């Protein structure tokens, strides 16, 4: 879960024409995805590629694209060994899930 790593500035609002998907990229294919983020789909942003969080094996990045071009970007990235993890308004519900994780420990106690 990304209930603590979520940021409103890390995503692009007003999803009528533009939306930023949380794209996971590996450490080996970090440079290969940086030279193919503009060519993954049509009407995708070529300057929105920026790492949101980083791990030891892979790196999580944000990729702004069109509303109808998210499927074309996720299809080519799945062929390019990249995964696209969806993020929505349920991150505020995931913040209540951390409170529900505290309520589960409160109910267990």
């Amino acid at each position: 879960s990304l209930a603590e790593i979520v940021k409103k500035d890390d995503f692009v609002l007003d999803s009528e024409y533009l939306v930023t998907l949380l794209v996971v990229v590996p450490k080996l294919n970090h440079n290969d995805w940086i030279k193919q983020y503009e060519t993954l789909a049509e009407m995708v942003v070529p300057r929105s590629s920026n790492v949101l969080s980083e791990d030891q094996d892979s790196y999580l990045c944000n990729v702004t694209l069109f509303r109808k071009a998210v499927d074309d970007f996720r299809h080519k990235a799945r062929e390019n060994k990249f995964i696209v993890r969806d993020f929505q308004y349920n991150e505020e519900e995931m913040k209540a899930d951390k409170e529900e994780m505290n309520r589960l420990s409160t109910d267990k106690k």
Partner: protein, 52 residues
């Protein structure tokens, strides 16, 4: 350069959207009410002859 051109092509995808978002209802509802105001010619012409 290419980071600006895809931004500038997105402005073109806004402009071709803006032509689609300013002419659909502006052509349809201008033909909708022409039937409706034409009905206002027809709905009066029954009764205004009936008073005659």
């Amino acid at each position: 350069a290419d980071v600006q051109k895809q931004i500038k092509h997105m402005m073109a995808f806004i402009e071709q959207e803006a032509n689609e978002k300013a002419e659909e209802i502006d052509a349809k509802a201008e033909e909708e009410f022409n039937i409706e105001k034409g009905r206002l010619v027809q709905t009066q012409r029954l009764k205004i002859m009936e008073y005659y």
